[PDB]
Amino acid sequence: SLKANFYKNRVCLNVLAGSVDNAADIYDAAEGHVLVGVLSKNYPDVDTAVEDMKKYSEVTNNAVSVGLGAGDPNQSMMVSLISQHVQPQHINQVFTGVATSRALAGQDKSIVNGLISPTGTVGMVKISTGPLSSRSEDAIVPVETAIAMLKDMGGSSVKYFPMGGLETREEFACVAKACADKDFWLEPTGGIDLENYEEIMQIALDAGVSKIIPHIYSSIIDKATGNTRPEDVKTLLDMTKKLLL
């Protein structure tokens, strides 16, 4: 079960689970059109992570997204090694970890995203997002080339982060158009909430992006419990059904 369940073959929500029970409720709320994020940084080692994420898999039909955790690029290798055993539907990586994860996954079905970042210049993206490279002078390249490199490395989609706000909408619209033109998928991430979901998504849909995996994290998480609100997952589904007629 390696193929994510995109709604209308177009959109798959990606949200964090606070617990195995929370993952079950999110999966029901989304009618299965979702990927439940579980973060490697919440585990002391690969084996513990693997053992726990299998429990998430059992209640979501393997709709699990393995993530780095706290944006920490030093988690990249652990994510690759967990994913090799978990065989998830989705893997988050940094630019320098895309090829590793695809090689260790050993098949072409798992979605492997790659972190690239806005720069303040429409059409240019930052690709130095790895453990050591994230701390060097920025690597800034044409967004078309970034996508070609990600494709060369076995990547499935661009994870564009931090989305920020209105200041990066122009930059975002240009990344979405580049994705559509290179037939590549897109994963908007950062600051998405119930009030801006429709607008952001419409940009990617108008650009003609084929498959879109929006990441919606803290805006729908109850900080008292660490759980994603299932009622908010249902709202996102409703809005996604509306966006697509």
User: What, of a copy of itself, Mg ion, none, does residue 137 touch, CB below 5 to 8 Å by kind?
Assistant: a copy of itself
Q: Please, what is the end-to-end C-alpha distance for the chain in angstroms?
A: 28
Give DSSP secondary structure letters for 17-59: -SSHHHHHHHHHHTTT-EEEEEEGGGSSSHHHHHHHHHHHHHH
193 in a labelled binding site: yes
231 binds a copy of itself (CB under 8 A): no
DSSP SS3 for 90? strand
Question: For 118, phi and psi rounded to 5 degrees?
Answer: -65, 160
User: What, of Mg ion, a copy of itself, none, does residue 194 touch, CB below 5 to 8 Å by kind?
Assistant: none
33 in a labelled binding site: yes
Site string for a copy of itself, 68-87 (x = CB under 8 A): --------x-----------
User: What, of a copy of itself, Mg ion, none, does residue 151 touch, CB below 5 to 8 Å by kind?
Assistant: a copy of itself
In the list 133, 196, 210, 235, the residue contacting a copy of itself (rule: CB under 8 A) is 133
Contact status, residue 79 vs residue 56, Cβ threshold 8 Å: no
Contact residues for Mg ion, defined by CB under 5 A: 31, 193, 195
Contact status, residue 96 vs residue 76, Cβ threshold 8 Å: yes
CB-facing half-sphere around the CA of 103: CA atoms within 13 A: 8
CB nearer to a copy of itself: pick between 100 and 189: 100
In the list 44, 70, 107, 137, the residue contacting a copy of itself (rule: CB under 8 A) is 137
- Among the residue ranges 33-41, 94-102, 111-119, 186-194, the one whose residues contact a copy of itself (CB under 8 A): 94-102
Q: Which stretches of the chain bind a copy of itself, using CB under 8 A?
A: 76, 95-100, 102-104, 127-128, 130-133, 135-142, 144-146, 148-149, 151-154
Residues annotated within a binding site for Mg(2+): 33, 193
